Ligand binder design. Structure first.
Ligand SMILES: *C(#N)N1[C]C2=C([C]1)C([N]C1=[C][C]=[C][C]=C1C(F)(F)F)=[C][C]=[C]2
Length: 207
């Protein structure tokens, strides 16, 4: 009844990735993954500790968690892989058993204040009775492409993790019709070393 992974019984993440394809992939294809989730109870982290890193007026982590449901709420810590005029992409995929029309907002936040939001819709495809929600190869919003290139040219990774300590993403998934929450995901970030590639730990947010 406790989650084993990033999802409810109602809506679950199949896959998420932010990536870059260099322009020479048109000949000899090759992708770089900044972060990547591909899909034993998860460890929990108290949500009140993480209020700092997200805004607190509306669509902030307090008021959504007050609004619930609590089991839809997750924290992901990413270790971003930051070594690599190509294409910059985000691909996300969810799965259900209801036929819903999803709305996915992504709040990019800085010192816990919203800087960019992207709000997409996806209706389901029926595949194996299981219903499938594909938001694939979405262009990365230019704030975060430019953030990456600024970030990557820092001379020390403690400077990078100093920056990313004040950098968060809140991703909010709702049924478009019923206006009810399905899955809300806070993201906190570090830079992994060069030898490491991308990695993640997934938590429940409890209160
Ligand atoms: C813009 N458009 N977006 C929407 C959106 C983005 C960027 C992310 N970005 C993300 C997630 C994890 C690690 C790195 C990044 C990025 F793109 F480099 F900032 C996630 C969700 C939605």
């Amino acid at each position: 009844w406790q989650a084993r992974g990033l999802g409810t019984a109602r809506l679950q993440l199949v896959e998420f990735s932010a990536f870059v394809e260099p322009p020479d992939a048109v000949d000899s294809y090759q992708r770089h993954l900044f972060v990547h989730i591909s899909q034993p109870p998860l460890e929990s982290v108290d949500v009140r500790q993480i209020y700092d890193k997200f805004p607190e007026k509306k669509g902030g982590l307090r008021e959504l968690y007050d609004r619930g449901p609590p089991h839809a709420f997750f924290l992901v810590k990413f270790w971003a892989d930051l070594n690599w005029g190509g294409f910059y992409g985000v691909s996300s995929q969810y799965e259900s058993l209801e036929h819903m029309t999803l709305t996915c907002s992504s709040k990019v936040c800085s010192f816990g204040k919203q800087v960019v939001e992207k709000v997409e819709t996806e209706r389901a495809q029926l595949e194996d009775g299981r219903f499938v929600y594909r938001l694939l190869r979405s262009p990365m919003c230019e704030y975060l492409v430019n953030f990456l290139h600024k970030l990557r040219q820092l001379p020390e990774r403690y400077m990078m993790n100093s920056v990313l300590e004040n950098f968060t993403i809140l991703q909010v998934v709702t049924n478009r019709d019923t206006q009810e929450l399905l899955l809300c995901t806070a993201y906190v970030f570090e830079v992994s070393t060069s030898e490491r590639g991308a990695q993640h730990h997934i938590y429940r947010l409890v209160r």
